[PDB]
Amino acid sequence: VDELLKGELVPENLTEDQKKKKKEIMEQESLWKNPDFKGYNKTFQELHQLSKTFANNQFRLALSNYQSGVNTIMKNRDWVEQYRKEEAEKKRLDEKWYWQKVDRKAREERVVYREKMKAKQDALNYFSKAINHLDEIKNPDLRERPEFKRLLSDVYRSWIMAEYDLQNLPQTIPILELYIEIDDNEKEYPAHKYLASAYSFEENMIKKTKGPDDMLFKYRYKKNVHLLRATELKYGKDSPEYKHIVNVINRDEVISV
Amino acid sequence: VDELLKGELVPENLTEDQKKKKKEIMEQESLWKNPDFKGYNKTFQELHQLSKTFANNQFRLALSNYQSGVNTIMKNRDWVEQYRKEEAEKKRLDEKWYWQKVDRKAREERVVYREKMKAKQDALNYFSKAINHLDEIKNPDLRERPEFKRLLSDVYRSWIMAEYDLQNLPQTIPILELYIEIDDNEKEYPAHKYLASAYSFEENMIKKTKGPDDMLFKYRYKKNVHLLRATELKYGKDSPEYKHIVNVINRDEVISV
Amino acid sequence: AALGLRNPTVLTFISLSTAGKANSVIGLCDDALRVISKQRADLGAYYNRMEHAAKG
């Protein structure tokens, strides 16, 4: 079952009384039909933010940005694959030394790395726009629908994956934590793998900059919790991998006997 | 028992003779019915300030302002709690260093402090208006009623708490001394806690500006009086805390052997 | 944000803590300098026309 097949949040169209209420309001708005009206006080028109029309429109804008961001990521890999194919197939009539091949190789790596970061940064802007569109859906009922949770996880996942590639690890922590609070994403070991690395980065920065000891411990404890959880979710509890991590964490943490 | 349930100071409506006397006066006022009359000499019309109608109108004015001031404070705490909640829930896509978190928090603590000081000033104007209304109730009998002392203490209490947050400590002393003369308010330890601090502020200023020695000792003696009393009300006499304060007070003041 | 020295969406501004980054910033300042120069030109052009009008 695909929740994004129809590309909509909630399908908008039953009671006889409700059908009568809808009839009289439509008649009233016809009397005061004035397309040039602009509400001086914004409170009343802002109630349109709670409508189903508004939520559908915001959902489709976020969907449009999400698709564009994924297109940015996917087209880049297509270009990188094509670029490597073209480089290997062209004739090198002036290359005869091993260090020349190493030199030619390094340029291709620099070109590829340069383009990848540009694609990641371009895609991240699309995802950040997609994130903002969903945040202004103010209706809690529409936020619990399967379609909303399907897109919300996909937008969060791609944004987290891209932001990590730009080495902006501490920014992924707030988004990752909101990711594992939706449906059963908490049982995914990749989610806890990223949090282990991200909190390790925070721990080093406090150690390096000689920050507060309290923040040093909190980043260390959060690092161990998600490191152990990721090990359990992938290799299982009381597994050889799990026993290895417990020895590491106990050695790293401070305990009292 | 709530003295403000009915929202009135004294209920205004028995003797057979008095009922007859009121009737003839109502008849005299009918003969001289002149809505446009204005007294050249105000002494006679000023006697209306001794009436029950006058006090009831003033009591509602003081009650009306008191509610506005109290509602002003309470709406602010709702705003501060709401403001802190919204800031923590919005996304920081460009915040990756600890000092960035420190700086963002410092901005928020300034915004919160700005509104609190603004809210305290708005309420303090209301509480001062409530105080002004109650001082022009010129009937001593109506000033002893339980409804009056109930509102008088609440207005003074709210005013003093607002004034202390604005750091106008020397102004609280005259009001606090009026507060502890109402019913058994003197047996509240918070009333003596504020007088302990306010008199300490007065003693510092005389010491700082090299004021008179008489004013130095008067504010020093009063500071010790209300510090010792506040300890007794909250922790009791011959308690370890009360023993602590006596040593401090005896050390600070001047005694003769 | 308008001069290209800060992302209008994410709000991150340019950095020189990496040699590779600094090389790309050199190009960024060239476009930043061009935008200011193009702006000063239009302002001066307005001033010249206004100067003629006052004399006229």
Side-chain angles (χ1 to χ4, degrees), chain A residues 128 131 135 156 159 167-168 170-171 178, chain B residues 91-98 100-101:
Chain A
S128 294
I131 287 181
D135 291 335
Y156 278 13
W159 194 96
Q167 304 187 352
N168 293 310
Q171 280 102 337
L178 295 195
Chain B
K91 309 203 170 304
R92 314 300 187 176
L93 306 185
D94 63 336
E95 175 178 300
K96 67 174 299 185
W97 311 109
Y98 179 65
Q100 282 176 319
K101 299 183 174 57

Side-chain angles (χ1 to χ4, degrees), chain A residues 156-180:
Chain A
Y156 278 13
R157 195 182 311 111
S158 285
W159 194 96
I160 290 159
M161 287 195 299
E163 182 82 341
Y164 187 82
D165 287 357
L166 305 172
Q167 304 187 352
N168 293 310
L169 276 58
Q171 280 102 337
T172 49
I173 290 176
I175 306 297
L176 271 167
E177 288 179 339
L178 295 195
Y179 177 82
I180 64 176

Side-chain angles (χ1 to χ4, degrees), chain A residues 78-136:
Chain A
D78 307 334
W79 179 88
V80 170
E81 172 267 326
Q82 188 60 36
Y83 176 73
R84 290 199 167 105
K85 181 178 183 177
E86 289 184 337
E87 293 309 315
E89 291 173 353
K90 59 176 55 179
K91 306 178 182 302
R92 310 301 194 176
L93 306 181
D94 63 334
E95 176 171 294
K96 74 178 300 177
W97 297 113
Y98 178 76
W99 61 270
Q100 289 187 327
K101 309 188 171 59
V102 182
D103 284 345
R104 172 180 135 271
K105 172 186 308 297
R107 299 194 302 270
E108 302 171 354
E109 304 300 322
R110 287 200 300 269
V111 171
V112 160
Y113 179 89
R114 180 189 59 196
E115 295 297 326
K116 284 188 176 182
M117 285 295 184
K118 200 160 301 176
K120 300 297 176 61
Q121 183 57 40
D122 287 336
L124 179 85
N125 293 324
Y126 283 149
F127 298 152
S128 294
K129 289 181 180 179
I131 287 181
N132 298 319
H133 280 295
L134 298 183
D135 291 335
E136 57 182 345

Side-chain angles (χ1 to χ4, degrees), chain A residues 159-205:
Chain A
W159 194 96
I160 290 159
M161 287 195 299
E163 182 82 341
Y164 187 82
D165 287 357
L166 305 172
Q167 304 187 352
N168 293 310
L169 276 58
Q171 280 102 337
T172 49
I173 290 176
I175 306 297
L176 271 167
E177 288 179 339
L178 295 195
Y179 177 82
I180 64 176
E181 297 294 335
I182 305 164
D183 287 327
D184 283 3
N185 296 139
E186 205 272 352
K187 298 146 64 181
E188 302 169 345
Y189 76 93
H192 298 260
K193 175 189 60 177
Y194 277 64
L195 283 165
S197 298
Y199 276 96
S200 192
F201 190 100
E202 297 270 24
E203 183 206 2
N204 294 329
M205 292 298 305

Side-chain angles (χ1 to χ4, degrees), chain A residues 203-216:
Chain A
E203 183 206 2
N204 294 329
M205 292 298 305
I206 302 292
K207 191 196 310 298
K208 180 182 308 303
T209 66
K210 291 181 300 303
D213 293 350
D214 299 330
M215 307 302 297
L216 176 65

Side-chain angles (χ1 to χ4, degrees), chain A residues 18-256:
Chain A
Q18 290 179 354
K19 198 158 301 179
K20 182 170 176 294
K21 179 66 176 298
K22 191 169 59 64
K23 182 179 178 58
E24 63 176 0
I25 285 185
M26 182 178 60
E27 295 185 2
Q28 289 185 4
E29 298 182 356
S30 185
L31 278 181
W32 301 83
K33 176 57 183 176
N34 187 16
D36 310 330
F37 176 80
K38 307 166 196 309
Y40 171 84
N41 189 29
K42 304 294 179 295
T43 305
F44 186 83
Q45 207 276 346
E46 280 178 357
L47 301 177
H48 181 258
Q49 295 175 349
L50 309 179
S51 69
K52 296 182 177 180
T53 300
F54 175 85
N56 296 338
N57 210 15
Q58 296 296 340
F59 191 88
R60 286 189 173 177
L61 288 179
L63 176 64
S64 176
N65 293 265
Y66 172 85
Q67 296 181 359
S68 299
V70 175
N71 176 78
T72 301
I73 298 291
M74 292 310 300
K75 289 302 174 54
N76 182 255
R77 297 174 181 173
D78 307 334
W79 179 88
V80 170
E81 172 267 326
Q82 188 60 36
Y83 176 73
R84 290 199 167 105
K85 181 178 183 177
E86 289 184 337
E87 293 309 315
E89 291 173 353
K90 59 176 55 179
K91 306 178 182 302
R92 310 301 194 176
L93 306 181
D94 63 334
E95 176 171 294
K96 74 178 300 177
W97 297 113
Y98 178 76
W99 61 270
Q100 289 187 327
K101 309 188 171 59
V102 182
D103 284 345
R104 172 180 135 271
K105 172 186 308 297
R107 299 194 302 270
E108 302 171 354
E109 304 300 322
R110 287 200 300 269
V111 171
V112 160
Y113 179 89
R114 180 189 59 196
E115 295 297 326
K116 284 188 176 182
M117 285 295 184
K118 200 160 301 176
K120 300 297 176 61
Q121 183 57 40
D122 287 336
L124 179 85
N125 293 324
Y126 283 149
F127 298 152
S128 294
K129 289 181 180 179
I131 287 181
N132 298 319
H133 280 295
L134 298 183
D135 291 335
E136 57 182 345
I137 298 183
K138 301 286 105 177
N139 202 324
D141 169 62
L142 301 171
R143 294 187 59 90
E144 293 293 331
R145 301 184 53 91
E147 303 84 4
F148 190 85
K149 294 179 178 299
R150 169 65 188 276
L151 185 60
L152 189 51
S153 290
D154 274 6
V155 171
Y156 278 13
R157 195 182 311 111
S158 285
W159 194 96
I160 290 159
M161 287 195 299
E163 182 82 341
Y164 187 82
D165 287 357
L166 305 172
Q167 304 187 352
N168 293 310
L169 276 58
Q171 280 102 337
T172 49
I173 290 176
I175 306 297
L176 271 167
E177 288 179 339
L178 295 195
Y179 177 82
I180 64 176
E181 297 294 335
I182 305 164
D183 287 327
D184 283 3
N185 296 139
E186 205 272 352
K187 298 146 64 181
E188 302 169 345
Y189 76 93
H192 298 260
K193 175 189 60 177
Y194 277 64
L195 283 165
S197 298
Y199 276 96
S200 192
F201 190 100
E202 297 270 24
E203 183 206 2
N204 294 329
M205 292 298 305
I206 302 292
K207 191 196 310 298
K208 180 182 308 303
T209 66
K210 291 181 300 303
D213 293 350
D214 299 330
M215 307 302 297
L216 176 65
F217 298 149
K218 188 241 291 183
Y219 294 141
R220 181 188 299 173
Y221 163 77
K222 290 276 186 175
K223 174 199 54 175
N224 290 330
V225 159
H226 296 267
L227 171 61
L228 192 58
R229 189 86 181 93
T231 308
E232 175 177 4
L233 289 172
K234 183 186 178 183
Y235 300 99
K237 196 175 173 56
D238 65 81
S239 54
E241 288 81 7
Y242 184 91
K243 293 304 183 61
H244 196 58
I245 308 304
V246 176
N247 295 22
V248 171
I249 294 179
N250 175 267
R251 208 190 320 271
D252 184 73
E253 71 176 340
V254 177
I255 44 90
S256 57

